[PDB]
Curated annotation (Swiss-Prot), chain A:
<protein>
    <recommendedName>
        <fullName>Transient receptor potential cation channel subfamily M member 2</fullName>
    </recommendedName>
</protein>
<comment type="similarity">
    <text>Belongs to the transient receptor (TC 1.A.4) family. LTrpC subfamily. TRPM2 sub-subfamily.</text>
</comment>
<comment type="subunit">
    <text>Homotetramer. Isoform 1 can interact with isoform 3. This interaction decreases Ca(2+) influx through isoform 1 and suppresses susceptibility to oxidative stress-induced cell death.</text>
</comment>
Amino acid sequence: WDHQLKLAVAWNRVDIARSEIFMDEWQWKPSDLHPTMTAALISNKPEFVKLFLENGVQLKEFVTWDTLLYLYENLD
Amino acid sequence: ESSKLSDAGKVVCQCGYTHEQHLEEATKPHTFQGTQWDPKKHVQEMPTDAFGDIVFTGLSQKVKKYVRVSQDTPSSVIYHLMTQHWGLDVPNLLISVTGGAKNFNMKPRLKSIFRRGLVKVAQTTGAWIITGGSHTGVMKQVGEAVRDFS
């Protein structure tokens, strides 16, 4: 369920990312999506951001110091 | 002491909750070491202190109420608690959903009806969704169908 989301990031297709790998028993442990939330934020790809927001990816503890340091090194 | 030892719980006196035996105090003979202690005679009642609130670590941000209650408790006390001390008004509909917890398999048409109709009946009449509290199965479908609507 991490490799499928890694692939779905590159597909640029939301309904496939929703239709199978978010309809089964998804093990929450929301720290999984941080490496995927970062890729979605960088690529922009703004639509996956909302999709991850329905799945409990709270931004208040997602944004760490090192995560933002890495984000600012990947500007356009 | 139970004849059948549990898996890694061989030190269990037929209940083995938290001790070498099934007791939260001294395992005294009590002047009678009655084999196969009756639950009515052995088990007693202590006042509760395990009440309060819970917040899930990182999964959510809201607060949830919880109360540990005895096996035998008058429903008037529980209702008075949830009305006065919990700030819950009288409901309009009481729907109780129950189903398979550990081994549940569902078809997509089955999943859609929970995704839609239960939410529609819950959000109009202001019903009271009462069910079992666990992390598996139809109650998980109910939980996801109630969080995604909110």
